[PDB]
Amino acid sequence: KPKLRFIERAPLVPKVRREPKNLSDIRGPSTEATEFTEGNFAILALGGGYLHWGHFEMMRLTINRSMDPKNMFAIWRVPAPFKPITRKSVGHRMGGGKGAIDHYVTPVKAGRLVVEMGGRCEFEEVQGFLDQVAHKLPFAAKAVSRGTLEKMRKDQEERERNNQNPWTFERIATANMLGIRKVLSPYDLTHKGKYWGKFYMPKRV
Amino acid sequence: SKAVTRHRRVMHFQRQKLMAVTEYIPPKPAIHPSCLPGLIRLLRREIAAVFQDNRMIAVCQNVALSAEDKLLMRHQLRKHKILMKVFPNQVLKPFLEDSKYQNLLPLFVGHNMLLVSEEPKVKEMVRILRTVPFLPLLGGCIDDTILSRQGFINYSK
């Protein structure tokens, strides 16, 4: 079964209890599915966002059509939509209780792999349609190999080491210099200024 | 507005100043570094063997011919013991000085194809070239003796 597996619209056992839109699941760096597993290529999410069944279908159809099943295999690195998003009836006034469950999404944080590909192939053979999928994804995304991912991580480390700026967001935020924590967020103490809402700034050091 | 927004939320001016101050500064390297200071050997052996074996060598520019015309020329040459050879100039240049052929340097430029043999059928070869008024005979060096085209014609006669 090398081809990418089908993803259901909603979990077979639907959730009955509406739950809050905890945007923290989109905010910040990704702590899961950050490394390669049984594959050599992937789509890396350079930003946070929610993936819908429409996005899943786009990914599945494009990758399945453009891949070579006898030499390439693909695997999801993100679970099927599970978080329920609720919408009220069109034209409803505010109040009257939380809306009914409308759709299911799956959160994705910056730095996560969405799909992972492998097999008897090199990067250039796959990067085309992987980049197409990444560009059509709801968040900033990039087709990345193991080598390219390691290269970008090493480049980030090198920039952090050799930056000539005496002042860094990490240092200022941690020391509360100028009392900037009045303006910053507690999450910023760990984001080090590289994340702003759902957006991840890669050039940011 | 929520902390996470679909758009890039406007930062508080102090946060904007903090980000601008804490932007990455690359290291300036003072003076720009930009303006600071098997097959090959196989054909080496092949060329050495060719030179040692062949008693007479000629060269030409068989590049203006069709595939079939070149094949016919090759067949006519093989009717005699002469063998036509193709080798790159990029690796042929060293061979002249390696085998002590100083006068052969200004002869192998561009397309160059060798006509190595021991028994010269030069008379019939020139007759064949005559009906095709191009592809001139180019200077060669028989048995370590450079011959011009007049020399080849005299030797033929």
Binding site: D68 | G38, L42
Partner: peptide
């Protein structure tokens, strides 16, 4: 070895064809 480099050229052509399949 002529056969060695012939096989190397064949493999390089195969790799180029595989890369250009999508291109």
């Amino acid at each position: 070895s002529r056969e060695y480099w012939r096989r190397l050229r064949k493999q390089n052509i195969w790799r180029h064809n595989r890369l250009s399949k999508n291109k």
